[PDB]
Design a protein around this nucleic acid. Structure first.
Ligand SMILES: [Mg+2]
Ligand SMILES: [Mg+2]
Ligand SMILES: [Mg+2]
Ligand SMILES: [Mg+2]
Ligand SMILES: [Mg+2]
Ligand SMILES: [Mg+2]
Ligand SMILES: [Mg+2]
Ligand SMILES: [Mg+2]
Lengths: 44, 49, 223, 4, 53, 49, 109, 176
RNA sequence: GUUACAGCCCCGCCCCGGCAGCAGCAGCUCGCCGAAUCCCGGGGCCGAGGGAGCGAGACCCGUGCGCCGCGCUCUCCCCC
RNA sequence: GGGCCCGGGGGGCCACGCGUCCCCCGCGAGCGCACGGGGUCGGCGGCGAUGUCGGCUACCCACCCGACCCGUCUUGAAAC
RNA sequence: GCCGUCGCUGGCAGUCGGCAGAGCGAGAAAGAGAGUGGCGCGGACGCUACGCCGCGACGAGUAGGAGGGCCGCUGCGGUG
């Protein structure tokens, strides 16, 4: 629960968490654009 | 992971000391190359030597 | 010396930056930013001069003293706390005051002061609530909002402006509405009031006082 | 030494 | 076991290697593949009760 | 770096067991994973009698 | 002017069948008859208001015979909309079956 | 075994442990209906032990996996052959059920065998589950739903929201 | 009696015939999970301890935000 | 798939001096923010000399839950 | 959170101050060693060592045992 406590014990957790936040925010963008083209293509 | 991070306590000099620092693990299990909570989780999870 | 730069590392979440250690190293150009290894005041006098101690030893010591406190962190003073505001309270929202002499009245939210208390106006002419501070924890924010984006709130309506002024009692001392406050009330009322009258029946709504009645339960209804 |  | 250990301890010593001397309890069986050999496992069903008196 | 390495190590163990079963299923056989080497034991009964 | 509190009944104390925990009271709130509707009321102030023989001071007012014990809703209780409340002093058992005001603050809406 | 919740169908494959005599023992497969796979494996060993000189110690589970219903949107008739222990003997039964899933039909059997014969799931052995055509079903309860023009009303509908309101001014109506 | 003025089941060839989607906001048709997991929010209870020092140093005698962990800026120069 | 994810022809790295030999091919300075060795506010309000404020316990009374009378011998006592 | 017990047969004589220099909790033996040649006058508390301080675990009890009572009663030697 405490971020800075985990880093004092496992500094590599910061890299893992940052990657998850970027990876998860990147995959969300892909679906939103993927879902849109499905909507726009359907309207065609 | 969660068993050892939330509820992980070391038996250091026959006392129940919370694992709030890596130096706690290194001073006791360092002779086995176990110097951090991550080494401790790997020795447990994989059942090391 | 050099002018400070905006942090090159944008915040991803609280406590984690966007860029790793080596990404920041390149951004900060650290590859080329390398580096290598009075207590007495003299005065004249009519002896000639006296060396004077700025701060003197105490003339008295108590029989007992308390030790020092251990050092903590994050325990900021109040003036440095961050202020939060419910997302449902946006400028122009019609709030319901829940406490004080004005409890039940419906007011117009203007802005959140630096101390975090809300600034609201009745307006005075509709329900007799002047420019007054109020805690957001003691207001029900309704879904009724008026657009006051074009309303100019005087820059001097700050926290110190509304802070109560002590009155001494030796009989009683009474609060006097300063002439400045009356001028201030008109400046803001004269703008918000015509905006209220653009919405039909809104002025009548702000004249009325909220109350619970038979069969009306807060958890059931929408404000 | 190199870092400096 | 004493003899085989001392001989292994002496045979491996001259060879500069390491051998197991201590016994160990049976470990859990390691992963393995089972070949069906192009046959379907026999379906089994419980048999009806029959009063064999 | 030990934590970084373990992450890669754990990932391969996870992926490898997935991959092993797929190649068995591909050929119409069964992959039987190794009996677990680790157990967690929780006492659920009191101390009377 | 009008009412600005919800009507609640002091149903009883926290208890098993043969043990009673008087530091917690169980409030039945009018209209709240499921556990899913109790969310609005959690953390809300609760006032047991009563009258006594001797006069007592009044904030922003002159002395009268009204007295109050304050508290607040701490959590839901059961599946039918009861809430647990804690008070600055345990409610007297003479208050079972009587009115407990539930205010509309601290407001989260 | 407890018939907790809705049962699932598992495919359990096991064999004797290989030995020098028989290096490749044959593979036995059973259809097991159970709450979870851990229970599914346990029941498998309870049945093969009855049919073969085999038990958990001298054999292993080669594959445990749920068998998904193949036509979950189709209505079928299932015939279930089962044996069970009553208080004073064992009896073979044949029963029919209508469902969308085979596991759903077996779960109906456990509730039904418990209701009509006070049979606990530990005394019931499902031997066979077969989807049956409408023309082969025997039980009139199942067969009365083989009507392409089936129609029936819902008489005397009982008010189920009896505590909302708890006190009301008007009496409920049961005709709809 | 066998697609007709409705439909249903199976099969052979059609790139597992082709497209979305994909254990689905058709907020429930059926699962197990998270090194393959992170973000934000709400209610409740609690605040035990009290000399942790930092830097200047025998060319200095300061200052009580100090350990470990994690960042930021400056000691470079431009641009918006 | 594994081999610091072997060797050759847009996105993250706890890569970042060099003389070299060659496998292979021992001290930079500052400043600052903090999920960082257990809470503070460098935040506020009301009332107050003759009827009001505080007083755990203590006196009387009330209510809710609990609650059989002790010593003893006894396997077993509230015991008819 | 607090009380006590037990254990660490744990720590503190280092209050080593201008005849001065503040440390030894730290992953991994043993020296903050000694040399020979190539302006102010200032710096809390402590230590009834039978004292003070820290950390961890624990706490049912008849018969019975043991410890501590700055619990209580009467008289004697000292002392107040
Ligand atoms: Mg028992
Ligand atoms: Mg009773
Ligand atoms: Mg009685
Ligand atoms: Mg007797
Ligand atoms: Mg007797
Ligand atoms: Mg008795
Ligand atoms: Mg009797
Ligand atoms: Mg005891």
């Amino acid at each position: 629960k405490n971020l800075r406590i985990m880093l004092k014990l496992n500094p590599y957790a910061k890299t893992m968490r940052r990657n998850t936040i970027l990876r998860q925010a990147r995959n969300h963008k892909l679906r939103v654009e993927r879902a849109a083209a499905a909507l726009a293509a359907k309207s065609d | 992971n969660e068993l050892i991070y939330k509820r992980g306590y070391g038996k250091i000099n026959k006392k129940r000391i919370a694992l709030t620092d890596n130096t706690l693990i290194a001073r006791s299990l360092g002779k086995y190359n176990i110097i951090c909570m991550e080494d401790l989780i790997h020795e447990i999870y994989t059942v090391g030597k | 010396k050099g002018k400070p730069h905006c942090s090159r590392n944008p915040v991803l979440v609280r406590g984690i930056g966007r860029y790793s250690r080596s990404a920041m190293y390149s951004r900060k150009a650290l590859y080329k930013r390398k580096y290598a290894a009075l207590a007495t005041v003299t005065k004249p006098v009519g002896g000639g001069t006296r060396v004077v101690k700025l701060r003197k030893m105490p003339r008295y010591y108590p029989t007992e003293d308390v030790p020092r406190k251990l050092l903590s962190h994050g325990k900021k003073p109040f003036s440095q706390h961050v202020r939060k505001l419910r997302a449902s309270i946006t400028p122009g929202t019609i709030l319901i005051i829940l406490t004080g002499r004005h409890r039940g009245k419906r007011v117009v939210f203007l802005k959140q002061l630096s101390s975090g208390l809300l600034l609201v106006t009745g307006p005075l002419s509709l329900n007799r609530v002047p420019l007054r501070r109020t805690h957001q924890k003691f207001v029900i924010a309704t879904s009724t909002k008026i657009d006051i984006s074009g309303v100019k709130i005087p820059k001097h309506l700050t926290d110190a402006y509304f802070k109560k002024k002590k009155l001494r009692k030796p009989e009683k001392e009474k609060y006097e509405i300063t002439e400045q406050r009356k001028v201030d009330q008109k400046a803001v009322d004269s703008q918000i009031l015509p905006k209220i009258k653009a919405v039909p029946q809104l002025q009548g709504y702000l004249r009325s006082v909220f109350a619970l009645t038979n069969g009306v339960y807060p958890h059931k209804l929408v404000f | 030494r190199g870092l400096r | 076991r004493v003899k085989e250990n001392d001989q292994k301890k002496k045979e491996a010593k001259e060879k500069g290697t390491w051998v197991q001397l201590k016994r160990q309890p049976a470990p859990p069986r390691e992963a393995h593949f089972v070949r069906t050999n192009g046959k379907e496992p026999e379906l089994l069903e419980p048999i009806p009760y029959e009063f064999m008196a | 770096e030990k934590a970084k390495h373990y992450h890669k190590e754990y990932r391969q163990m996870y992926r490898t067991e997935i991959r092993m079963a797929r190649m068995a299923r591909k050929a119409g056989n069964f992959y039987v994973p190794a009996e677990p080497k680790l157990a967690f034991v929780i006492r659920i009964r009191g101390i009377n009698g | 002017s009008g009412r600005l509190w919800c009507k609640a009944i002091f149903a009883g104390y926290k208890r098993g069948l043969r043990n009673q925990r008087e530091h917690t009271a169980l409030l039945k709130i009018e209209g709240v008859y499921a556990r899913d509707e109790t969310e609005f009321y959690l953390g809300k102030r609760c006032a047991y208001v009563y009258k006594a023989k001797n006069n007592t001071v009044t904030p922003g007012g002159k002395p009268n015979k009204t007295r109050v014990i304050w508290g607040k809703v701490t959590r839901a209780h059961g599946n039918s909309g009861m809430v647990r409340a804690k008070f600055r002093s345990n409610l007297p058992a003479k208050a079972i079956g009587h009115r407990i005001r539930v205010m509309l603050y601290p407001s989260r809406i | 075994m407890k018939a907790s919740g809705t049962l699932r169908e598992y495919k359990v494959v096991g064999r004797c442990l290989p030995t020098p005599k028989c290096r490749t023992p044959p593979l036995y497969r059973m259809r097991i209906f159970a709450p979870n796979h851990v229970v599914a494996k346990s029941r498998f060993w309870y049945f093969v032990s009855q049919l073969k000189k085999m038990k958990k110690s001298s054999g292993e589970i080669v594959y445990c996996g749920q068998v998904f219903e193949k036509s979950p949107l189709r209505v079928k008739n299932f015939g279930i052959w089962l044996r069970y222990d009553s208080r004073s003997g064992t009896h073979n039964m044949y029963r029919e059920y209508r469902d969308l899933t085979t596991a759903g039909a077996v779960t109906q059997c456990y509730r039904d065998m418990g209701a009509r014969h006070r049979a606990r799931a530990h005394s019931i052995q499902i031997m066979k589950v077969e989807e049956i055509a409408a023309s082969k079903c025997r039980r009139p309860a199942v067969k009365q739903f083989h009507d392409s023009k089936i129609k029936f009303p819902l008489p005397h509908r009982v008010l189920r929201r009896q505590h909302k309101p708890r006190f009301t001014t008007k009496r409920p109506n049961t005709f709809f």
